[PDB]
């Protein structure tokens, strides 16, 4: 059910200059089959030494506004200034060894990197984010003491103080896999300011809880087993091709159960058949010719029940155009047992123009919230919807037209974009295209999520706080920018109501506390990669609900 009249005589042309540099790229856009294709020309300008100075998307070339990027290079070809129309202006200076020395982002935040002196190998020591002067990172390197060589710690960063606390490294394998590390978190009333020389006045900014995690690895460096920060051990087994074939979890004080008892693979190493310690067997089917996933069949071999069976269909290019479920509807939807077919169509640029599927009946209009669950008692159904999407020539989604018959909830929702930027907010915030860039930072981070919600950002452009009306929610990130903390502070009932999540390797320490006491403490044990059929274990140390089992 693919119509190839969308893609006739729409190739992609890269136009070259007399130096064979790509100065124009040409696209042809046909949204529906009968009409003519529209030529979109993206412009790339180069200077005389041959670097890409300015680039212009096809929508701002029609507006006669400026380019998207205006870059200034040095004589070697590295960017010294980058005035992006979406991300602001970045001033970057590197030294002789191409290491960063001075970075000024678009909010005016000067970042420093001081290194070791000329008698040392010149490794990174500290990072200073001046706004008024914070030594925000501090790296402690190791020596070649025979105590350090026993744990393979020689020439590593043993203590790494960052924007969220401390990450201490304890042991390395003979391959270089970390076998033991520990990490403390900064307290809530303190930010990372690691000034000085002594480290004894840096532990009074850290939490008392030191969360150490341990691993064991084989000679190939693949992780065999992993102890979490609480003592729950995951253990993996590998087959003769080096792939993963099994998984076992033993909680602290308990025996060893089975999480994955079999996992076979195809010839290309894709997953083929997997039986869990649940007992449920999932089975992946693939195209012979293209090796694309054309089936996910989740079967429970105790009731001969197929829980889901998703058969995918594709374009010649690999766009999903048809998902049908050959399973029956679950126990939550009474009086119906057929799952509708999801059909998708695309433009000539392969962007989604239409989409059908199933949705609940009491959902209403889509917003930031998720709807109430369909319990097995309230005998509610699902209905059919179809959404149609519209885009401009910059590729921004401008309009979602949700049309659901048999319920009469037909709504459109528009995204109001700028003329100079790709910065565009929802139409509830602003209907004017000229007051959209007032809702963003100078770096292009959005500053207001909804009409009554504001967002606060770090010096390095990470979400520091989502201010709601009465109750904020703030986060913390490490030096890589990965989230290590999420503290949701609900408003005053008689006191604050605080929910804290700590993100550890293979462990989430979700805890809820009032003024003086913890009212809930939950240790979520995760097994595997999220999106790769992850298994979670909810273990309650304190404040378990009545009806659920531990």
């Amino acid at each position: 059910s693919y119509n190839s009249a969308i893609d006739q005589k729409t190739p992609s042309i890269k136009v070259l200059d007399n130096r064979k540099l790509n100065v124009r790229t040409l696209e042809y856009l046909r949204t529906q089959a009968d009409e003519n294709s529209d030529e979109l020309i993206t412009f790339y300008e180069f200077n005389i030494p041959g670097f890409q100075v300015k680039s212009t998307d096809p929508r701002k070339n029609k507006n006669q506004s400026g380019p998207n990027f205006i870059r200034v290079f040095n004589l070697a070809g590295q960017v010294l200034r980058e005035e992006s129309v979406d991300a602001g202006r970045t001033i970057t200076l590197n030294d002789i060894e191409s290491r960063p020395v001075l970075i000024i982002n678009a909010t005016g935040v000067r970042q420093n990197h001081r290194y070791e002196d000329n008698t040392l190998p010149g490794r990174l020591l500290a990072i200073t984010e001046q706004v008024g002067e914070k030594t925000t990172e501090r790296l402690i390197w190791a020596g070649n003491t025979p105590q350090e060589k026993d744990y393979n710690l020689a020439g590593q960063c043993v203590r790494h103080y960052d924007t969220a606390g401390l990450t201490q490294l304890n042991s390395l394998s003979l391959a270089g896999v970390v076998l033991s590390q520990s990490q403390q978190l900064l307290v809530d009333d303190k930010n990372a300011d690691w000034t000085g020389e002594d480290q004894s006045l840096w532990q009074q900014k850290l939490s008392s809880d030191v969360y150490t995690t341990q691993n064991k690895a084989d000679a190939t460096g693949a992780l065999l087993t992993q102890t979490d920060a609480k003592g729950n051990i995951q253990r993996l087994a590998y087959d003769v091709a080096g792939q993963l074939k099994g998984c076992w979890l033993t909680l602290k004080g308990q025996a060893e159960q089975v999480i994955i008892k079999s996992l076979t693979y195809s010839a290309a190493g894709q997953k083929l058949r997997e039986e869990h310690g649940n007992g449920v067997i999932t089975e992946y089917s693939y195209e012979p010719e293209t090796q694309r996933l054309i089936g996910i069949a989740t079967r429970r071999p105790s009731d001969a029940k197929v829980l889901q069976d998703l058969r995918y269909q594709y374009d010649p290019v690999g766009n999903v155009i048809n998902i049908r479920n050959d399973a029956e509807a679950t126990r939550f939807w009474r009086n119906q047992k057929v799952v509708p077919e999801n059909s998708y169509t695309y433009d000539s640029l392969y962007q989604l123009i239409s989409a059908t599927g199933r949705e609940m009946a009491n959902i209403g209009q889509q917003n930031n919230q998720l709807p109430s669950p369909a319990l097995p008692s309230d005998n509610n159904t699902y209905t059919n919807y179809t959404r149609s999407y519209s885009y401009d020539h910059s590729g921004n989604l401008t309009q979602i037209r949700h049309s659901s018959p048999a319920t009469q909830n037909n709504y459109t929702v528009a995204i109001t974009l700028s003329n100079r930027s790709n910065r565009g907010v929802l139409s509830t915030l602003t209907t004017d295209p000229n007051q959209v860039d007032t809702l963003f930072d100078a770096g292009g981070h959005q500053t207001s999520l909804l009409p009554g919600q504001t967002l606060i950002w770090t010096p390095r452009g990470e979400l520091k706080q989502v201010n709601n009306g009465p109750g904020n929610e703030w986060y913390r990130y490490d030096s890589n920018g990965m989230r290590q903390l999420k503290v949701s502070e609900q408003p005053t009932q008689n006191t604050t109501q605080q929910q804290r999540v700590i993100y550890l390797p293979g462990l989430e320490l979700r805890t809820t506390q009032s003024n003086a006491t913890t009212t809930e403490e939950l240790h979520v044990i995760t097994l595997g990669e999220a999106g790769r059929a992850q298994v979670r274990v909810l273990h309650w140390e304190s404040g378990k609900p009545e009806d659920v089992n531990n």
């Binding site: 691993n215 992780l223 992993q226 995951q234 993996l236 792939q243 993963l244 998984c247 190493g269 894709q270 997953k271 992946y284 996933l293 690999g318 890589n480 990965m482 390797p505 293979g506 097994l527 595997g528 990669e529 999106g531 790769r532």
Partner: peptide, 16 residues
């Protein structure tokens, strides 16, 4: 970056 479906990649239980 926008990549394809998750089935294409190798398994990964522990990284940073």
């Amino acid at each position: 970056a926008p990549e394809k479906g998750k089935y294409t990649k190798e398994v990964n239980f522990f990284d940073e």
